[PDB]
Symmetry: D2
Subunit: 423 residues, 4 copies
């Protein structure tokens, strides 16, 4: 279809393409042969022969697609093509393997590449956020609670908040990786029966050959490490959605506080976040995976994994681009901050007044000053100055200072420094 711009990443689509999947499938079968020759399970020349045939092997992709439709899966047709190519040594291919072993393991190999690309995009996101946080550390603007002026903040403060989430997501990525990056090799019902007593030796050797962890046990039907990976994609997408909401709303005509380098990046991010969320939902369904293999639940991973990855990668890329070139308008920010003519810093007059009148009293006086500033379509300073119960204890100069929003930024700057932590 042709509608608009895609939120899916082409690099992440190349990664989960048929050609790439198949080549990881071959990679797995060759490593299995090698693992078995080292453990003396198949002849050493059979593995040598298999290794060499694979160096020169080029699958016949259309034949593969056609046979998959007949057989249900590409693995045994792929083994047939590889066997034909290898001659006599090919008779030792896929020895003790089942289809889900090769498909799970090839999937894990792609997930390794998928996660390196995700990590790379999360690191660019953090970099562009740290720059915004640093450069706009002292750029004042209105803080908003339910879309309405609350107290002054700075734009670097906002960027630091966005950044803090991505610092946490970077940490999550590193925790999830050793759980999901494990080999699958357990055979038709997960017992490796066809290998007699040597099954666990093969499984461990195979992990080593591919540079993967070893699972505690068969995970044909224990899908939690894969589900948590897509859940993680969905969590990152949610954090992208938050900043996309903020930016697209700051692009409102009457605000005009920023501009993207239609907020098209925000559009793609916000739609994509919901689609990734849906892929996480499917993975929670796919976990209800009955007995030793269930084709229904398993089929659900086949969209949720590659598409969760493609879409999450594309919206991270949209965020890298948007945040990297974000146009920030301190002039519009300053103008919007003055919109309430000091009302936004009523709290600062209360704080200053309380030691003189007491706390409830200070609150009552200033809220009265605020109702009148509003009702009289004038500034808070111009109301408060005529009110001797405030003006006399504070003085007019102090009132001018306290009603200037630029003077009430609190720990904003220090909070930014804390998150940046010497970046």
């Amino acid at each position: 279809p042709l509608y608009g711009r895609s939120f899916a990443d082409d690099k992440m689509r190349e990664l989960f393409s048929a050609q790439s999947f198949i080549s990881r499938c071959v990679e797995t079968e060759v490593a299995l042969a090698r693992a078995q020759a080292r453990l003396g399970i198949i002849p050493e020349d059979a593995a040598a022969g298999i290794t060499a045939a694979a160096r020169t092997f080029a699958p016949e992709m259309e034949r593969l697609r056609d046979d998959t439709e007949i057989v249900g899966y590409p693995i045994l047709p792929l083994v047939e093509q590889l066997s034909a190519h290898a001659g006599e040594a090919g008779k030792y291919l896929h020895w003790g393997a089942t289809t889900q072993d090769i498909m799970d393991t090839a999937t894990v190999l792609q997930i390794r590449d998928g996660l390196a690309l995700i990590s790379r995009r999360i690191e660019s996101v953090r970099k562009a956020l740290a720059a915004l946080a640093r450069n706009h550390r002292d750029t004042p603007m209105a803080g908003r609670t339910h879309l309405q002026h609350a107290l002054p903040v700075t734009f670097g403060y906002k960027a630091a908040v966005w950044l803090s989430a991505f610092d946490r997501h970077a940490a999550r990525l590193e925790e999830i990786s050793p759980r999901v990056l494990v080999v699958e090799f357990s055979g038709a019902s997960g017992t490796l029966a066809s290998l007699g007593t040597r099954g666990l030796d093969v499984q461990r050797e195979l992990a080593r050959e591919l540079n993967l962890g070893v699972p505690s046990i068969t995970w044909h039907s224990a899908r939690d490490a894969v589900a948590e990976t897509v859940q993680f994609l969905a969590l990152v997408s949610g954090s992208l959605g938050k900043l996309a909401m903020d930016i697209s709303i700051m692009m409102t005509t009457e605000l005009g506080e920023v501009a993207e380098p239609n907020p098209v990046s925000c559009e793609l991010i916000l739609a994509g976040a919901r689609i990734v969320r849906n892929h996480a939902t499917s993975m929670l369904d796919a976990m209800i995976h009955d007995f030793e293999r269930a084709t229904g639940p398993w089929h659900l991973e086949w969209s949720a994994v590659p598409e969760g990855f493609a879409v999450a990668s594309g919206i991270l890329y949209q965020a890298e681009f948007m945040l990297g070139g974000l146009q920030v308008f301190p002039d519009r920010m300053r103008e919007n901050l003055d919109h309430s003519r000091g009302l936004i810093v009523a709290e600062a007059v209360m704080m200053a007044l309380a030691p003189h009148t007491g706390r409830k009293e200070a609150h009552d006086i200033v809220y009265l000053g605020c109702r009148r500033a509003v009702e009289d379509k004038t500034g808070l300073f111009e109301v408060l100055r005529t009110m001797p119960e405030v003006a006399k204890p504070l003085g007019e100069e102090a009132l001018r200072d306290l009603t200037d929003p630029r003077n009430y930024l609190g720990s904003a700057g220090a909070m930014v420094d804390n998150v940046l932590g010497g970046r």
Copy 2:
């Protein structure tokens, strides 16, 4: 409503009750007063007075409920009741705090208790699974792929697979806890402006008083650590759903391989898993939390957190009970394993035959033997014995051995030992 049995945990409901929430709210305000007196921000006798008034303070809950409906939130009415009770020292309560600070922080205190109860139930689940895995390590049964006989497995093998997931969930719980268990104290728009330059000192002192971490920055609108907690609840629930599917299907009249101590625990687990999944979905939506506070998204946490916790706790409790007293029937298991009369171990004859005939040939001979056993409504041994291309190379005694499913369990036992790891 009155329908059937509840999948929600009453202990987890007491934990998120109004009374408990309110008492954590008071706990937070008192700790805030104490933190401020140590940093010289409020008078030491004001904090002493607040601490003592709180020891004797008992909220007026109906008054609180009524005022919340007027004000929108219980915090300021609760502060009013506590102020009245404390006399003069009460004027220093909620100093520099906003409502979401107290509500977020009190929520975090409940989550600490919620997570200890979740951890406790996950540990009982693992214990009952390890017992099943150990005692039934060698109990043979049919492995099933798409609900059909695949190869022999043991029931302890199945339990070890279920167990392996829960071993991983235990690890996840420990990783998530330091992220979610952090104080919230940042004031009305997250800058602590009302505290001048001392805001971060207060925030850190307050974390110490309550024994919580310190956030990198304000998380009024960065909700990822809370979202990941409910996502985690949903992942555990998914693993409960998998074993509930397996058990309820093994209770099928024609199977009869186990019994619960209607599979009512399986019913509750399986419905509950979908409801927890829905609470995780809501949390991903709640993450799109615009600016410095957005009431819509925030309102979504108010069901998703307490109810995600209550339901996940209740279905973990149902699993503790069911798995702790699971009735396992090795007799029905043995009978179902013999259903195919050796067909389930055709692969074992192939494995044995291959060295004599070659691999494709062995496969073709035995699949032919299998088609005839089926078409002739007899056992595989009785077909193969009359087939000299198998009988002569193997011998009839070997054929009897190879067609007995009890002889083809592979690494099942060793895989169980691996997961148990000296439990």
Copy 3:
């Protein structure tokens, strides 16, 4: 829990309470007895006795709750209490019935009341929208596409759009009602075997007694009419969410175009819409209802129906209230419309210019006029007037008229009249 305001309707909660459910359960059993006495299936005095005992019968609710936990369901304990109360005639109660018959049918009776209350709230919503549409038919304001000024619209036009959706939802409600409002009476596995050949006679008589339709066949496991009802709740909630988005954004400080009578109604509506959506999701899951009864899927209806109803009713009530008393500010609307100083009606100059210069040419001239108005921080009229390729063909008076947004409202008024259709 105590957090804020509830989005759930108390009337709709009373409707789905245990007491109400139970009383519909009794209503169903009595009607079943009556249906059977008319068809000569049970003695006429047995039905008379049952009818009279039920007039005076008051369930023992705590005993019921306790027994449900033992039995799994309230129906047979409720039949026991009713039997005891009726004396000898009680021995003919629940004759040929199963538990799901009584529970499905009692649920349908509540759904009838639930749908009348939903219809009532949808009619108040439409009324308050028609008033807004009518009174503000000619109130000009900026149209917004991706939150940015597009062309002029009127606020009545916006209200008419919101209204049009609710006109369609009213129609949907009437279509769904005869599908969902049917009796369930089919016995333990849906064949009414215990009634010999008279089962369908009883089922039809029973529908008549309760004033319900007759299903085509047993729907113990065909749940589509119930699922479509909650889906419908979710669709209405979505339309409430749209207008809640619009209103809460129009309450933005810099907009200030309306006010609710924190946009608390918008908060509740927007959170509630997602929760109703989640209840619809659960109903789609509950539809996968295996064989003749499956307790897992069925358990899912037990939250999704009563809670979908309660929440959808509460957010409709919030919308009735908010829209009924909506404060509309034509002054802020007029001010925001002038924000772009005629840029918002560049299209009107193009339209007028095209006959003179051609179409692409008119577009190029005016877009150039627009770039300069922006770059020169002045109004579009003040730029265009100095541009003889526009000023000379059009004349300055015409330019003044064309750059006034109030002159470019198109069919807004007529579109409003169309939707109102003589209301």
Copy 4:
């Protein structure tokens, strides 16, 4: 990607392809020109010229794709290509139109074709179900409640239940069609300002030209008729999931009651049902469509509509195929029905006994007979015959009859006839 078989329909993919979308886009623009020439809004030769250029027009698809990435949408680039081709008459193209008008309307044209294909597949589904219901009307089998033997049913009875849902879905399709099949033509902010006073005339003429209804008002941001269409797809998918659950479980080795013509159709249906459910979820999100156009929410339709259609069509096709050639095994059905050796018809002995002993007494006697049949691993008849409190009042011949499950099918046959209703 290459994994297994697709659940998406290629015909439905051709329908939502770029080429097809674009050709409907041209169809819309030509009809708009024609509508305008009839109302005297553009010259008659301009429309004639546009009509003729379109007969010969062939878009340059790669150029279109490239320009969409620059412009955001294919509409204005497509208008440019069509203008170039038409010469002078092309200057009247897209007169008063906005991009979403053409894209919404072209989408509606595809939905018309999509719904005809859905209707066609629902009619084949109903046909294959009616055949199964009719041919197996009297084929006895065990009814199952929570996967366990309940009472006898027939397989035609099961098929009639499945059928009844699809009869209702056929009715729903006809109700939804006039709501969703309406033109979109309202211009940039939905007021048709650029057409002065003639906008509604054009909109109505255009509906007539394309053979669509006329909307009550602009639906750029009122998306309920589109959302309800995908919700409907999700409801049908749910009903497919129910029968797919039933069939795949009846393929369990120990059951063996049916076979598909791996239950691969059941796999695809069951995964697809969850994916369609997810597309319905996205549509409920897309409904929160702020102001006069919001690109984020709108972008969500761009996957949910074409993919909801493609997947729902593919799983309907899988069901047509599977149900059309379903292998039904009355022999395995009869064998499983005898599994309980009369226990499954204990209720029939109770029914017969009650007039002699009373009702509670009859229940107690037979449940005792049932406990002993179980504990003694013998048939119910062989226990009951030795029990004079049953044997003497009933007689042994009657006991033999009552313990034969084939004698207890109730209204099964009549219920089948009711649903078939003379098919």
